[PDB]
């Protein structure tokens, strides 16, 4: 007969047994403080609420640096091309009757920015509530709720600035801001594209294609190339106003993740705060079920839009069944979650996730509780 | 003087005459159940609420299968090319002083997945409410409300995973999941692009372009082609981690539509449930207006991002005017809606819609009531 | 000790001291009216609320007209090409032993539509509230709240139809509707792309690239070109159902901005209206701080996805500190905002914005109050 469920984050209330409601639209980039002494219609309760500015957390794959460069054309006339040491090149031989060779190569290379592929975007605010001698702080994700015996704080919002798959480019001492690219080259990079010339890891260029053709023109042959000769950096700069900038504040780069506070004050979210002074709220997720967790296996990749899957062994006691969520987390960041009705005893639960880095150990978690160890996922782009 | 309007789905309440509020953030992929006996401060009322998991419904155009293949180059030397039977080919003749022909053709073709263009995305939850001997179930769209005399259930949420225009690729026995492509080729498909080699309907390939050039190189000429030789499937697989996967559960494919439950447990929506035990809510859309409906004509297409327009003849009685919505629906799925202030008597109302398939008969509907017949739209991509 | 903050738009209420709540999901394209006489459990208060249809305001850059055309190939044999007057052309000379010239040129040019790049998208509803002899109307942005002593109206919603960076194409007497393009050419335009042939300002074509190659074939040489010969307009029309249409009503074009009401009746937003008859709401943004404003400088561009930055000199009196927002606005439209904790006396505040046109004078604003003059930003695409 029981059907315990902790996936509901919120409260049941009797509107006549509630004492205070705060309901408002708040600038995303602003904090908010509320302080009041709650008195009886000779004992007072101190209420102190602090809501911090909206933070964005983006799980990314670092793509390395984008480069500007010049495309050079050379003519030579077995026996190797004069330009052979160039990493990025294209050639055609005209031979017989040794050869007579046309070559293209990139040179005057210079890094212009660092690029990051968006894997996941999540917004949150840190919320702290003191009610009497109770003090509790929690990072509340947008579209989730802070729940306590006497106070509920729900945040509801939407933002459409960034999308999964976008590429963020930072031109310099990041902070300040960057550009969003919606069409950074991936499966085909041709010279001229945004993202054309990349160095994924300081060494090794991923060279673009040169889709055009050579031609040979009473003396010496002269080579011509009839494709595009303008680098992607130059083409983008020539129409820079076509691209979308964003600004940042208090940036924090870590491996495969960027967090910051977006200072765009045009954005708002909705905050609702409900307080009951006497009779406790009915916590909708209250239950007597107890969960033990450990990892079993993992497959897939960090830093990947495809992602990974963490297999968890989950033990349920004190309930016949329990509808809940099992998460894949490491160091207080969660990368995926699976809603599941557990049955009493052992359960096997697969959790699909995305994000993290080579050093991540993805743990099986329930609420704030996690397994003793996590598992590493595989590298992407092998 | 009257200005009846049923476009407001919700209630007016006196907060002191309300008995229970449930307010919470719920895991999108989780159900929720609430059961309580409502008692007087010796007669009890059974309250039973069942909210089902979020479902996504996507109106799509089935694009057929994407293929891998190999690009082959041949040299021949009136009188037809040795490779002439290949559906996808490209040739250049070098003649005079019969010809001497260079050819490219695709072969070793193999279907790798089924592709679907997103036309419309809608999320919903089925909500069932028992209050006493009243029992009512309704599919509630995200950002709409369930309304009854004693209970309101509103769902508010946002999801940004899928966008109109995205292409979904399913690699195998769909269920499990798929990939999202944001740049599947449409107006120009070149060999190497995602979507390059398609078969829209099991027969007939839509062949990609081959943008490169041929060249002819003491004996026989040998042809060369200087464009890309790697298929789009291979190029995408080589950088697969650049693309975004999604997972699915309890899939249901129908013609030009896919429905499933997304098991991503990181997503949440907001649920508000308000209950009045005694005095009925004021239903904000209550009215005495009566509507009769029939179709008049249709133009445009199913399976199209451009869409169709259904013209409806709508009769209004019992009101001088009525602000309401007229919808284009078939088999309990609605594909478009027009808000309109009807005037007493006959009205002509045009409803713009998107989606459906060749067998769809788009009917004129108001609320749960529809015309006796619907009209077929035209096919896309003719 | 004080920490005044006006970034919270909303109210604190005691639920037992509130008299009426309206909560509902409203068709985006519908208005809503509520009229009631508020009576004591012999004096009545007239309540009259009018909510107007959702309006979209899009800051854009007008891209000029897109053209259809025909690609013509000519052979000629110092001394200028027969086709030299064509604005869009491509040539290769085959010379020595004067030249023998192959040329391509565009002709039969015809404008097919007007294109606009989306810079910013904002939705709003006009809300008017009469409570007794108080009457107040305000344009309320989605996810903001109307706040007065006796009535709060909050709008919460999300729409995903348009994105920053999309290109809107209007084919004719705009109104009716248009097409959305997610991949309009920017940094590289090749013949065949959406956006290939543009005229930014009635004179001057921005010509596309012709990435293919010429070749020369007992008499006269004949030129061939092996690249794409089909215009972008024709290629798009050939697969028009792949693109997304939208409809419009009561359009209003101004320089670099378009406003309209989207008649898509499938879209809804959420409206909450709370009324207290007797004791005034606690306005969460109430404060005694007083602000003076003037511009100091500006940099950056109108009509640009990169944007501008307006530097404001802001004087704070009557408070030691004040957390608020300073905006960049002109003629009752705001283009950016910065949340800031001002300190008593002078402050320098930088406000990042996007949008506007050459005639815009961006002013420093707080609430409904603005500086006496604004500053012009620079043109984009110079
Ligand atoms: C959720 O999806 C993952 C992802 O794997 C799928 O990705 C799709 C894009 C598509 O390519 C499909 O063919 C592919 O299976 C599933 O994980 C995969 O499962 C298969 C079969 O068990 C394994 O062979 C893969 O190694 C494995 N990959 C990863 C990264 O885990 C997963 O099964 C699916 N369901 C759940 C509950 O996570
Ligand atoms: C809503 O838009 C449709 C779509 O038709 C428009 O699509 C735009 C993308 C653009 O190309 C524009 O030129 C085009 O008209 C309108 O329907 C069309 O209306 C015209 C004129 O009556 C007819 O000739 C078309 O056949 C018709 N097409 C379809 C599919 O119905 C429609 O009028 C407009 N308004 C409403 C209220 O639906
Ligand atoms: C908010 O961002 C703007 C935009 O300028 C940045 O844009 C990024 C896309 C990237 O290219 C980065 O290199 C670039 O600085 C900042 O404005 C710029 O600031 C610099 C340094 O002071 C000036 O040299 C530029 O002229 C100026 N441009 C504009 C349009 O204002 C701005 O500083 C930043 N911060 C704030 C608070 O607005
Ligand atoms: K080439
Ligand atoms: K070609
Ligand atoms: K060329
Ligand atoms: Na070529």
Author numbering:
A (entry chain A), B (entry chain A), C (entry chain A): 6 to 46, 50 to 85, 93 to 112, 128 to 247, 251 to 415
Provide text from the study.
Membrane fusion is a critical step in entry for any enveloped virus, and in hantaviruses it is mediated by the highly conserved glycoprotein Gc.
These results therefore indicate that formation of the carboxylate-carboxylic acid hydrogen bond is essential to the organization of the tip of domain II, and that the reason why this region is disordered in the neutral pH structure is that this interaction cannot form.
